[PDB]
Amino acid sequence: SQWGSGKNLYDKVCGHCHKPEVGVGPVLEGRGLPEAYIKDIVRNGFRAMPAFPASYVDDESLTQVAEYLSSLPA
Amino acid sequence: SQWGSGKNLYDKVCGHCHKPEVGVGPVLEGRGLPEAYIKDIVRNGFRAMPAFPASYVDDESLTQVAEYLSSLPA
Amino acid sequence: AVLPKGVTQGEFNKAVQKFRALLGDDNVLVESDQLVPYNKIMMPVENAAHAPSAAVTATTVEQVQGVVKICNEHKIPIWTISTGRNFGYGSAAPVQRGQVILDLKKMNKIIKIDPEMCYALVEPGVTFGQMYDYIQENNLPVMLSFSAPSAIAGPVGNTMDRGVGYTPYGEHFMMQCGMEVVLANGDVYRTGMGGVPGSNTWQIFKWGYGPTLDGMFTQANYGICTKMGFWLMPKPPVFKPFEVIFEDEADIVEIVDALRPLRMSNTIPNSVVIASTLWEAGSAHLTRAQYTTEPGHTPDSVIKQMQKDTGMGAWNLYAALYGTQEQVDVNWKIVTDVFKKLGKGRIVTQEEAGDTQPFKYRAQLMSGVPNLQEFGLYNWRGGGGSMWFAPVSEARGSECKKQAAMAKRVLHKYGLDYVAEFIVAPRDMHHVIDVLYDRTNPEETKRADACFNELLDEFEKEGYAVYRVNTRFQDRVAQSYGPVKRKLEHAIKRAVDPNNILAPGRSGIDLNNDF
Amino acid sequence: AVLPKGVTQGEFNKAVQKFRALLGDDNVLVESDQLVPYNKIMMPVENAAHAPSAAVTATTVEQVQGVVKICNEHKIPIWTISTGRNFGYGSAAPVQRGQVILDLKKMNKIIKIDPEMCYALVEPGVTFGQMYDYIQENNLPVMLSFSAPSAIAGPVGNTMDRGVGYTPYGEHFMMQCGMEVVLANGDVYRTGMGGVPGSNTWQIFKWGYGPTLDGMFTQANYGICTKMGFWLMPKPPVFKPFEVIFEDEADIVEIVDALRPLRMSNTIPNSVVIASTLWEAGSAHLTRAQYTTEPGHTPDSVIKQMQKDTGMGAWNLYAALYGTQEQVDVNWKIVTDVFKKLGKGRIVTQEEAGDTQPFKYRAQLMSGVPNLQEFGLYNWRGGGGSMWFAPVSEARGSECKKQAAMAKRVLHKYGLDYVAEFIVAPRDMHHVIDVLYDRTNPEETKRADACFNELLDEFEKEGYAVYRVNTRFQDRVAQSYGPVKRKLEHAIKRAVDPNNILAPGRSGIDLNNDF
Numbered sequence A, B: 001s002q003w004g005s006g007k008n009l010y011d012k013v014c015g016h017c018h019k020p021e022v023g024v025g026p027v028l029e030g031r032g033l034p035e036a037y038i039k040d041i042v043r044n045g046f047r048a049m050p051a052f053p054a055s056y057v058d059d060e061s062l063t064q065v066a067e068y069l070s071s072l073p074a
Numbered sequence C, D: 001a002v003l004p005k006g007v008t009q010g011e012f013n014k015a016v017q018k019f020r021a022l023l024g025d026d027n028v029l030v031e032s033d034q035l036v037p038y039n040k041i042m043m044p045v046e047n048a049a050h051a052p053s054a055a056v057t058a059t060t061v062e063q064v065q066g067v068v069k070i071c072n073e074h075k076i077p078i079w080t081i082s083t084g085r086n087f088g089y090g091s092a093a094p095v096q097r098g099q100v101i102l103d104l105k106k107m108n109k110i111i112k113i114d115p116e117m118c119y120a121l122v123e124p125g126v127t128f129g130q131m132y133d134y135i136q137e138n139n140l141p142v143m144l145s146f147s148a149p150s151a152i153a154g155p156v157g158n159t160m161d162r163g164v165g166y167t168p169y170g171e172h173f174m175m176q177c178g179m180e181v182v183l184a185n186g187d188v189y190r191t192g193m194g195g196v197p198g199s200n201t202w203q204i205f206k207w208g209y210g211p212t213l214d215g216m217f218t219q220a221n222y223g224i225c226t227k228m229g230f231w232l233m234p235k236p237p238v239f240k241p242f243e244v245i246f247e248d249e250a251d252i253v254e255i256v257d258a259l260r261p262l263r264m265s266n267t268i269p270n271s272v273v274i275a276s277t278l279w280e281a282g283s284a285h286l287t288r289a290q291y292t293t294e295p296g297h298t299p300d301s302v303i304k305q306m307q308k309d310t311g312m313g314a315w316n317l318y319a320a321l322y323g324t325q326e327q328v329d330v331n332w333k334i335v336t337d338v339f340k341k342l343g344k345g346r347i348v349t350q351e352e353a354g355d356t357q358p359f360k361y362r363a364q365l366m367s368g369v370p371n372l373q374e375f376g377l378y379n380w381r382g383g384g385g386s387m388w389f390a391p392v393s394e395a396r397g398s399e400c401k402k403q404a405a406m407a408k409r410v411l412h413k414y415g416l417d418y419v420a421e422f423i424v425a426p427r428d429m430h431h432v433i434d435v436l437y438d439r440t441n442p443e444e445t446k447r448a449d450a451c452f453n454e455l456l457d458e459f460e461k462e463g464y465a466v467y468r469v470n471t472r473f474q475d476r477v478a479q480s481y482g483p484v485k486r487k488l489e490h491a492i493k494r495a496v497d498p499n500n501i502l503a504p505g506r507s508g509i510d511l512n513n514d515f
Ligand SMILES: *Cc1cc2c(cc1C)nc1c(=O)[nH]c(=O)nc-1n2C[C@@H](O)[C@@H](O)[C@@H](O)COP(=O)(O)OP(=O)(O)OC[C@H]1O[C@@H](n2cnc3c(N)ncnc32)[C@H](O)[C@@H]1O
Pocket: C080, C081, C082, C083, C084, C085, C086, C087, C088, C089, C090, C091, C092, C104, C124, C146, C147, C148, C149, C152, C153, C154, C155, C156, C157, C158, C159, C160, C161, C162, C163, C164, C165, C223, C224, C225, C226, C374, C375, C376, C377, C506
């Protein structure tokens, strides 16, 4: 796809703020967050968090990252 | 005046090309060159030599440099 | 619902119909759920004031030329964005309500990276992260210079707004070389050596012949940049980062005055950052709530407490040495002696700090390694409200102290903090102040807006103006630079964009003004 | 006798009457014996083709504003000169016959030289010699950068034409900061931070806010520069000049490729000169007549003989190290090893050359000490005929070799010599070729004109163009950069000078053209 896999989207964009060692944003790894919720936060943005348009991160890539995050240990 | 003295015009402009150690132009020191001739070369320029307008080197300053050049030893 | 200023629902519909025919249906966005991510702003005003009417995504120069032809026909105003990560400066949202966003993120092609001549030619949608990957994969001996949002931001967008980096190639627009611009009439203009057919010097020699126009397009609405070239620093054999921690707030005068001869002589060749205690705190991910819950600004007593518990100073300077081992060793001996002779500040190196923050990220930023660590500044108070007040000053200590005190006073008046840093060049300082507030609290946003106005009024009175500002204050700042300048800018605007379609209002340039 | 193009004897007389009333009688020059020194050109055309109709000397900004108001009334075209020492580029004479010369030599005020912040703000008539005297008298720790005519030339004129120097601040327009321009409507515009009232940052921060227009005025006819600011290099404790003499003509490829990493890393921080044997000869004051009287070019056999008798090489490189003793010593060890590893070229220092020419003048030029030694180039063949063919190339060895061969061939075809030098920046070369000929010989001038045309045709075909050119070829070179560029330049010209009074024809910008 646009990012190939969800692991790739997480490593190149999301993880720069969300990885445990960073801590700009809360840990999303193994939290079982719904795909529909992740899609809402990325498209609307949440307070301190910026919003990313489809041209940057598409719907298909959001599905992949939601799935990748659920599969990891907490 | 504009250059103060003829020694000053020679040091700041003419001598950069005409002094013996330089040799871009021929030696003018103690050659008894006429004021009317020096006035003609500076205003018209001579081949490789550039011309200087009155705004750069005025008539009064040319008179002073002609007089300074005649007074020096060859 | 939302339409462009002066354009009727009918004319807009013919335009959207032509956009679709030219670009395809998935490249034209008119539904409000698709437009929502472009609307997110950190400015003290509601989203409605900067909401777009549509968003089109072009991928080729032929398409940008197309979008501009359609825009001239139906008098449609376009707002161009590249990577659109301009947080604290308007983000991805237009200067004015209802403008169409020409989103060029999909134009993400790296055209050339020459490892011998050390230059890069890229498209608008290229991110610094995308470039870092290409440089790592292909083992190229080049180094990047970038803004703190690094990985998510890009070269074209940051340089159009004349942004700043932290390596010796820090003043980004100084290192720019050659650009392709699509003008309002559809023509494709190439600056410098680009107009010459079969030229191999576009990214080599800056000026060209005749007037050199690269600067004319930056922070302006005279064309849409489609290709941009810049110079890359070659990877030095050794990189030596360091920090110098200072205890008193009044130490700023001596730090700046002692640092100046070292910057001017190029001993310390990079853009030096002198960060305040609160900026330093925010970047190390410390929140205000874990120190005080009291309303208004953070008192001097809790800042002094913050310094004891963590080891931060009132001013924390981060610099870096580049070169061969022998070059770095003699420069280290020069820098060390200057600080010893001062009898102030603790020197901390990579060995005694290494893996700890904020040293780690600053060292990464000064060597072209991406991280988004500095986004912790938005966690200091939270709420998602942030604006950059960035006045310009002389790299003279008394001036830095004067500006610091002026800012601190007006900010405290509105119950906000002085979270700032000085980015140092040989002769100038980019005094960057982050006016942080809670955007979900309507009373605090109303205060923040007033605070920003007063900050501009107070600084203009003392002869200071900002180098870049948010979309909401772009016209206001244009006033700081006098009427003759605005008059000249509108004359050029009438000449290159008679129909007023290229981002009206950008830097206060709009044909609907009386100039 | 000589009147402006399109202006009648009557309208011109009303203009001269108004000039006199505004400036005084001794500031308006209409007599041919007063106009004669402005007419001297080294171009292959008669004086008549570039003869002025009048010359006015202004001393204040109010007067320049006055001259422009009168010029707009009677449609009088003005040609502005500062120090007017543009030899080989049109000198002090106008692009077109009959233009009035606005001679600003009398505006020779040094407004400010800040020794701490290291900058200068000057008026057009200030010469580099005048600045050197002020710096010597007041013991200021600053260093100047200048073109070879140094003492007689000035900062404003050279930078308006984007000239080059030899110190680390060599690319003059890169170091420019802030300018005041009188527009065609009479308005006084100040770039960067100048528009802000009570600003102390005009010569500190380059850009300002909104479009940055300094570049737009250089090599253009969009305004008359009345004040210009620039940065000065602080005097380093030790200066170490050197030369590296190379034997073969084919050595150029390895010299350039070996020099590049040293320029890019800033080990050698100054504009390096790689001078050809004939350029070197001319500067050491050797004439052609003392070696051969045979017609046509100087044969390879007599050039090889010239090398044995004097010790010059095919390529003579002059560079310089700046900094502290320890900084210079480690950089000298790096430079020395690069040349030893090559196994080519003799290294000559200040100790083993010292008082001998051409080493002496180059060392002076690289340290901001004035001399007019390089004018010996006009003595190589004499006659007072000289034109600069200066193409731009990549600082890549194969490209330099290619350009050298192309030039040499076309020059020999017209019986002229290849007397050239490469001025090196990290990524670009200013390949400066002096097409020298005897102007008193009518057959050789006709050949020189044809040679210059063919030089431009040959280079454009291979994708190369010049960075600066003489008044006679300014329109020709404008063509090398394509139609879109010219179109944009005429659009801006109509907007800022509707009456076409500011130097029409400069850089090929004239409203009488179809663009
Ligand atoms: C939040 C934050 C912001 C920072 C920062 C740290 C934090 C925590 N650190 C920065 C730094 O060190 N240096 C900077 O210069 N900026 C910093 N910023 C702000 C930062 O977000 C921006 O500098 C920068 O990266 C902007 O992002 P961007 O690169 O995505 O640029 P953009 O696409 O938003 O474009 C900016 C601006 O440029 C104009 N425009 C864009 N593209 C074009 C084209 N093609 N043609 C014509 N004009 C163009 C437009 O007005 C746009 O808004």
